[PDB]
Design a protein around this ligand. Structure first.
Ligand SMILES: Cn1c(Nc2ccc(C(F)(F)F)cc2)nc2cc(Oc3cc(NC(=O)C4CC4)ncn3)ccc21
Length: 231
């Protein structure tokens, strides 16, 4: 319907149970967007659940959160969510391209993830799914948090599970690309406990704080910005 008429599909960005995310181009305004396509039944319990994401995103306005544009339902079957398309890399790709050498950049991008966490936490939300493929960089190199592997998830509920994820993400941002999985799995599992040898005093302090098993002993996003471990 509307989607096949008004847009041209460009690239599949992601595929799962959640449905699909497709990079599209609006034929009229000529811009690129990131559109989430979710299968749906009208007037259902699961419908009212997923529409919740739409009413959430339509009220987020932060420079470090993926902009919302529109949401609609087509033939019964499908819910489409139209969001800004961030042109540059995923944080994932940015990290693997040697982000770790670029410390002034690395601390800006961290502080930008934190500003995005604090905003959505102040609005009552929990992300639940923060990880490097769900963080985006725009054409000015600014962080934008989105959402469409067990190693980003808190052992344990509450908002501080996002700050555990962030601790894993920030370690990866601060360290060299781990090209093999078995290296990733080893180094990351040894941040969960009661750190690799080629490790950065202030980086280390921040991560240890965020990787506390007990969420009560982790900081809030606003706590950490106000902490003097950043500059
Ligand atoms: C509907 N929807 C959501 N939901 C959502 C939920 C919660 C929050 C929270 F922060 F508040 F929790 C934020 C957003 N996230 C989406 C991300 C989407 O994909 C992209 C892709 C790109 N670019 C690239 O992939 C190029 C190739 C590297 N840029 C922006 N968005 C598409 C739809 C999304």
């Amino acid at each position: 319907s509307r989607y096949f008429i008004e847009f041209e599909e460009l690239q599949l960005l992601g595929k799962g149970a959640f449905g699909a995310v497709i990079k599209v181009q609006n034929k009229l305004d000529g811009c690129c967007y990131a559109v989430k396509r979710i299968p749906i039944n009208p007037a259902s319990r699961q419908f009212r659940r997923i529409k919740g994401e739409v009413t959430l995103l339509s009220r987020l306005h932060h420079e470090n959160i993926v902009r919302y544009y529109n949401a609609w339902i087509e033939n019964v079957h499908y819910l489409y969510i139209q969001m800004e398309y961030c042109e540059a890399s995923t944080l994932r790709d940015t990290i693997d391209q040697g982000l770790y050498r670029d410390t002034v950049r690395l601390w800006r991008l961290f502080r930008e993830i934190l500003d995005g966490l604090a905003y959505i936490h102040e609005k009552g939300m929990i992300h639940r799914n923060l990880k490097p493929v769900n963080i985006f960089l725009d054409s000015d190199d600014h962080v934008k948090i989105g959402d469409f592997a067990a190693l980003y998830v808190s052992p344990e509920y509450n908002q501080k599970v996002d700050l555990f994820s962030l601790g894993i993400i920030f370690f990866e941002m601060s360290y060299h690309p781990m090209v093999t999985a078995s290296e990733r799995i080893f180094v990351l599992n040894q941040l969960r406990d009661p750190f690799p040898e080629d490790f950065h005093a202030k980086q280390k302090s921040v991560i240890s704080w965020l990787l506390n098993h007990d969420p009560a002993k982790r900081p809030t996003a606003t706590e950490l910005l106000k902490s003097e471990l950043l500059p």
